[PDB]
Amino acid sequence: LHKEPATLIKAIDGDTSKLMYKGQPMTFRLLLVDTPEFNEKYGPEASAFTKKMVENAKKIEVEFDKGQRTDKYGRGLAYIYADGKMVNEALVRQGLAKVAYVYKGNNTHEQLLRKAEAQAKKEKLNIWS
Numbered sequence: 001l002h003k004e005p006a007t008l009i010k011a012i013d014g015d016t017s018k019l020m021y022k023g024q025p026m027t028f029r030l031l032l033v034d035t036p037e038f039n040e041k042y043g044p045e046a047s048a049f050t051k052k053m054v055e056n057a058k059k060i061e062v063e064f065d066k067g068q069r070t071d072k073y074g075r076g077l078a079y080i081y082a083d084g085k086m087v088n089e090a091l092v093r094q095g096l097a098k099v100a101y102v103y104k105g106n107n108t109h110e111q112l113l114r115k116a117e118a119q120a121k122k123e124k125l126n127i128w129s
């Protein structure tokens, strides 16, 4: 997999963000995770976590996996990095997302994220509290 440039246009919620990629505005949905909806418990905290991580970064990058790059809603499907740190992983490690939506051939970082989830769960963080 390869990291490619993007810039933040606007935060949305815990697992989606509006980024400019190859010069075009796109909504990106984070691979292999699920955050609670803003309306749900830990939803606000996940949104805030993502927003801060992406807004504070000097460098945003997107990394597509091996399979489909857009979902049925036209959202980009990627791993998103903020100054080299993977947002997807960070949400899972903080107990602010569950590993989810693991479809074959877009699952390169599955084991990495399941390891973070196990740690979050052992620590009883947030969703696991």
Ligand SMILES: Cc1cn([C@H]2C[C@H](OP(=O)(O)O)[C@@H](COP(=O)(O)O)O2)c(=O)[nH]c1=O
Pocket: 015, 029, 030, 031, 032, 033, 034, 071, 072, 077, 101, 103, 106
């Ligand atoms: C994360 C992800 C979601 N999706 C689709 C599945 C779900 O369809 P449904 O809308 O039919 O439930 C929806 C979940 O996204 P949200 O969690 O953003 O709602 O997005 C993909 O198709 N591929 C993916 O990799």
Ligand SMILES: [Ca+2]
Pocket: 015, 034, 035, 036, 037
């Ligand atoms: Ca969600």
